[PDB]
Amino acid sequence: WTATSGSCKGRCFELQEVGPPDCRCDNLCKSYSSCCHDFDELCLKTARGWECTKDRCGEVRNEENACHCSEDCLSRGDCCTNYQVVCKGESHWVDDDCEEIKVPECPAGFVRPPLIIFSVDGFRASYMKKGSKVMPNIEKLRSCGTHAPYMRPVYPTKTFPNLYTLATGLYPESHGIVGNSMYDPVFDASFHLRGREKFNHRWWGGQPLWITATKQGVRAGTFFWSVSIPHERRILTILQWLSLPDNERPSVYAFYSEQPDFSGHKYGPFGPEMTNPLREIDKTVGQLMDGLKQLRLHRCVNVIFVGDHGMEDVTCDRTEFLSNYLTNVDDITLVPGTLGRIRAKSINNSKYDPKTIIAALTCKKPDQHFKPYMKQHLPKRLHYANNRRIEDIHLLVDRRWHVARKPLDVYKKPSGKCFFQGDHGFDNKVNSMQTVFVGYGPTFKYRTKVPPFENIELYNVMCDLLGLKPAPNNGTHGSLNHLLRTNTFRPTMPDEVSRPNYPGIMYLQSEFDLGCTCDDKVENKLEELNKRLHTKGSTKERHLLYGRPAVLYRTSYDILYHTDFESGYSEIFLMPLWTSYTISKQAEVSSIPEHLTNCVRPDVRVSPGFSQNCLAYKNDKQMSYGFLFPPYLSSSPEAKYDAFLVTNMVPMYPAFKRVWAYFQRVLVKKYASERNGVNVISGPIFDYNYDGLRDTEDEIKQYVEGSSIPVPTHYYSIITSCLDFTQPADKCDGPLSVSSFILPHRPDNDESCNSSEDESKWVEELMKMHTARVRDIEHLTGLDFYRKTSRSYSEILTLKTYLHTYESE
């Protein structure tokens, strides 16, 4: 109940929210059906429109008008935004030459430059170039300020997950808004775009920027606008708030536009109907900038122009139907569209089985346009599993497609034809899903292009712009320092927690009873000292190029040196946490010699009690083994024996060994050829609770049969070279270049529909799907890489957030 017979007189767009049953006058009151009776009359004036004209100049104030052109309007803070242009001979902001903003130029009483976030729903990254001729104001912000060629959204590339990621710095799995539609089994409650459940605070986790600001004494505008409030009135409202006295005036503001998304769904991303929405958004930016200029704030305010996601061509004819795959289609609930989420229709149905649903959905039709996954098997870069609101069964839908349960879901009578031509929600690496970032103002750089980055990083920067301490989030604070003129965040590297042991030769061959064998008894004062030097680390500068990784948790591990590679060997997990090696452009690939095919050699530096054993693998009929440093890339026949050390062995399903052997035998050399040498760090990952974070020992769900050898959920590699590929990886003077992956360690290759073919036809495609940031691997391993370079730490942080996407231009 709302007692709507209170009044909005002197309260229009009030900042403090009033509790029911008192009536509201704020920018969201319409959405709750709670505005006071006179809110339209007083707060939503429209008389005479939004622009001054020649004959209104100096008019007698008329309080009915939408905006004013009277002499007093500047002191009232309510002139039409073009007032000074029409009436006082001023230029529009867009027509002024751009001039560097070296220092904030703010009116007296301003404690900090205000921040305005201008959010555009569905604004695809390529609109910045493709629409630049019809967007002069946006083009001036872009060219004069700091811009990225695109900004990567989070998955799923839907509105609420992305807007809330922008506001919190959190992945959707952590902030809880995991789709535009959700079911929470604990609450037993459903969240939808339409309706009232979405306003309940229990859906919304983390700490969004407006709350962070308010807790730390920085006042915030109310960020959200009821859809029927016209854009011109949103802008006027912001400009009016900026005229409040110092003690009452917010420092952070948000504008939101439902366009170009609204038209993009109807017309497709590049429909000819899309030009008009882009022109209208540009005109709104112009209104805001003209308004700031009138207030003498256009060289004071930092403006962020940012989108939530892009838009792809999707039509209802490109829909896959689960009714063509599943017998039991009425026993499932599907969240449909550009992603699929499946769960049981009834929790009372004990005949429901996820295994049989996955199998019925796996590689069934030659050109199938979706792929099913248990959520823990989704690419780790999506960070889309650790939330009870994410159903166990997920469908990744190809770009340009939909999935639905049955045909009747997609049509309506009489004709059955559908309407829409655009949609979004697909994999956040998809080019059509990318969106925009421009920052303009005193705190941003002048005429500066920055590389693409992820929207999870922006919360930290917005906090920096406002002098706030960010709440704990998934950005990497400092990774976007290069966007900023000042207010940089200068982090220090994390302290190492565990120091390594450096074991020497401590065990005789006969102390080992591991059940391994090797044909290695091939029996020189010259060369003996040489092998001893290798074991003490004489080649370590070649193979460990950026320092040893730091171990950021408590554990016992050993550094092991060899001719061709260095490793950090965990006595707890019985295998390396990391193995590091450099392959120059000139390196040659060799075979595993016949006499060494099944060779595994005790490591006399490591106790039998802290070693794997071969008997366990013999007895585990499902599990085989591979090596982290690959024997194919040994520097000589003699160094090759080091590769068969039991301390270089890791458990691998035979299906996985197909993938790994091809990576090691073919792809590493290919990358060294193309990149002029590579440095490779490889290792295991254990994430059995799919939280994106390193498992402790007591979280491990699977061991090699009969043993304490834990089975990795994933294997990673980090592949580093010189950004200037005219320098070899091992003699690089400047910035680095990286690509990495986190490959799921699966007992089958059911994910790759073409796996019965030669690895040259499917393995690299798999690895691209599982591309990763170094930071992703850091979270999953508790290691900290690139500790010793010649590069600045913020530059390294940017490198650690890089994702190599394998998407064309």
Ligand X SMILES: *[C@@H]1O[C@H](CO)[C@@H](O[C@@H]2O[C@H](CO)[C@@H](O[C@@H]3O[C@H](CO[C@H]4O[C@H](CO)[C@@H](O)[C@H](O[C@H]5O[C@H](CO)[C@@H](O)[C@H](O)[C@@H]5O[C@H]5O[C@H](CO)[C@@H](O)[C@H](O)[C@@H]5O)[C@@H]4O)[C@@H](O)[C@H](O[C@H]4O[C@H](CO)[C@@H](O)[C@H](O)[C@@H]4O[C@H]4O[C@H](CO)[C@@H](O)[C@H](O)[C@@H]4O)[C@@H]3O)[C@H](O)[C@H]2NC(C)=O)[C@H](O)[C@H]1NC(C)=O
Rounded Cα gap, residues 128 and 139, in angstroms: 7
Q: Which chain residues interact with Na ion by CB under 5 A? A: 617, 620, 623, 749, 752, 755
Residue type, 182: M
What's the min distance (Å) between Cβ of 459 and Ca ion? 18
What stretches of 447-505 adopt beta strand conformation (E)?
448-449, 453-454
189 φ/ψ sector (left φ>0, alpha ψ -120 to 50, else beta): beta
CA distance 646 to 602: 6
Identify which of 228, 237, 227 has the alpha carbon closest to the alpha carbon of residue 159: 227
Which of Na ion, Zn ion, Ca ion, none sits in contact with 620, Cβ below 5 to 8 A by type? Na ion
Q: What share of the chain is helix, strand, coil (3-state, %, to 5)?
A: 30, 20, 50
Interface region with ligand XFY, contact rule CB under 6 A, candidates 223-231, 291-299, 640-648, 671-679: 223-231
Which residue among the candidates 81, 159, 435, 582 is catalytic per the annotation?
159
44 is in an annotated binding site: no
Among 82, 119, 386, 567, binds ligand XFY (CB under 6 A): 119
Residues 6+ positions from 767 with CB-CB distance below 8 Å = 659, 663, 667, 741, 743
d(CA 478, CA 488): 7
Q: State the amino acid at position 696 in one-letter form.
A: T
Residue 265 marked ligand-binding: yes
Token pair 């540009």 is found at 282
**Cα 82 from Cα 289, distance rounded (Å):** 10
Contacting positions for ligand X (CB under 6 A): 170-171, 173-176, 205-206, 383, 386-387, 472-474, 691-693, 779
Told to judge if 159 belongs to the known catalytic residues of this protein, a careful annotator would answer: yes
Q: Which of ligand X, ligand XFY, Ca ion, none lies near 173, with the C-beta cut-off 5 to 8 A by kind?
A: ligand X
180 is in an annotated binding site: yes
List the single partner that 225 binds among ligand XFY, Ca ion, Na ion, none, CB under 5 to 8 Å by kind: ligand XFY
Residue 757 C-beta: closest distance to Na ion, Å: 9
Enumerate residues 246-275 that contact ligand XFY by CB under 6 A: 254, 256
Distance CA 180, CA 424 (A): 12
What does 617 interact with, of Zn ion, Na ion, ligand X, none (CB < 5 to 8 A by kind)? Na ion
| Residue 461: CB minimum distance to ligand XFY, A | 13
Closest CB to ligand X among 90 and 691?
691
Among 13, 39, 223, 660, binds ligand XFY (CB under 6 A): 223
Question: Applying CB under 5 A, does 784 fall inside the site for Zn ion?
Answer: no
User: What is the number of residues in the chain?
Assistant: 809
Alpha helices (runs of H) in 334-407, residue ranges in sequence order: 354-361
Residues 166-195 that bind ligand XFY (CB under 6 A): 166-167
Contact in structure between 170 and 387 (CB atoms under 8 Å): no
Q: From 87-95, 261-269, 329-337, 524-532, give the range in contact with Zn ion by CB under 5 A.
A: 261-269
Of residues 440, 434, 432, the one with CA closest to residue 453: 434
Sequential DSSP letters for 397-461: EPTT-EEESSGGGT--TTT------EE--S-TTSGGG-B-EEEESTTBPSSEE---EEGGGHHHH
Per CB under 6 A, the segment of 131-139, 219-227, 413-421, 472-480 that binds ligand XFY is 219-227
Residue of 26, 57, 9 whose CA lies nearest to 237: 26
Cβ-based nearer residue to ligand XFY, 253 or 785: 253
308 marked as part of a ligand binding site: yes
Q: Least Å distance between CB 618 and Na ion? A: 6
Say which residues have a Cβ less than 8 Å from residue 12's Cβ, sequence separation at least 6.
25, 39, 42, 43
Helix (H), strand (E) at residue 740: strand 736-744
Task: Answer with the entry of Zn ion, ligand X, ligand XFY, none that 386 interacts with (C-beta below 5 to 8 A by kind).
Answer: ligand X
Q: How far is the CB of 167 from ligand XFY (least distance, A)?
A: 4
Select from 119, 94, 136, 154 the least CA-distant residue to 260: 119
For Zn ion, the closer of residues 313 and 795 by Cβ is 313
Q: Contact with Zn ion (CB under 5 A): which of 261, 282, 391, 566? A: 261
Q: Is 473 annotated as a binding residue?
A: no
Question: Exactly one of 83, 127, 150, 164 binds ligand XFY (CB under 6 A); which one?
Answer: 164
Rounded to the nearest whole angstrom, what is the least distance from the CB of residue 214 to ligand XFY in the complex? 14
DSSP summary character for residue 346: -
Among ligand XFY, Ca ion, Na ion, none, residue 687 binds (CB under 5-8 Å by kind):
Ca ion
Q: What count of Cα atoms within 13 Å lies in the side-chain half-sphere of residue 216? A: 17
691 binds, among Na ion, Zn ion, Ca ion, none (CB under 5 to 8 A by kind): Ca ion
Give the residue with the Cβ less far from Ca ion, 80 or 167: 167
Within 10 angstroms of residue 449's Cβ, the number of other Cβ atoms is 11
Min CB(596)–ligand X separation in Å? 40
Binding-site residues for Zn(2+) sit at 121, 159, 261, 265, 308-309, 424
Residues that bind ligand XFY (CB under 6 A): 117, 119, 159-160, 163-164, 166-167, 223-225, 254, 256
Name the binding residues: 121, 159, 180, 261, 265, 308-309, 424, 687, 689, 691, 693, 695
Residues of each annotated binding site for Ca(2+): 687, 689, 691, 693, 695
- Which chain residues interact with Zn ion by CB under 5 A? 261
The catalytic residue positions are 159
